[PDB]
């Protein structure tokens, strides 16, 4: 499911929120991507150092 | 007017989350009143609409547009 990657320090994870399939609020590590268009969060991006 | 705002950014917030379908059950379910009175002041039933033409959602509004249609 996941996407990975690193850039700058950081190491990001994306999940798409359709197979998350199990949705909660988090803390602040976690990016919501927006689609341009419609706007929803479809996926929560993850950090790290 | 305050208030106005207040409500307008928690729906421009909360929409922006369940993105306006999810929303459309969670209201259909909601029997929200003070917001949305089907039984009486057409005029109020401008003020409503419109109101959510002006935060742009409105498209929750359609059932109180028909009403809007209906009572003339």
């Keep these: ?49 | 007017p305050q208030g106005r705002i207040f409500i307008k950014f928690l729906f421009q917030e909360l929409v922006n989350e369940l993105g306006l379908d999810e929303l459309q059950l969670r209201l259909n379910s909601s029997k929200l009143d003070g917001m949305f009175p089907l039984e009486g002041d057409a005029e109020h039933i401008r003020y409503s609409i419109n109101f959510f033409t002006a935060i742009g959602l409105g498209l929750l509004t359609e059932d109180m547009r028909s009403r809007l249609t209906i009572i003339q």
């Design chain 1, 1 to 49: 499911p996941n996407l990975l990657f690193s850039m700058c320090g950081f190491e990001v994870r994306i999940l798409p929120r359709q197979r998350m399939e199990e949705v909660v609020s988090n803390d602040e590590g976690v990016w919501d991507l927006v689609d341009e268009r419609t706007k929803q969060r479809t996926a929560k991006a993850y950090l790290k150092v």
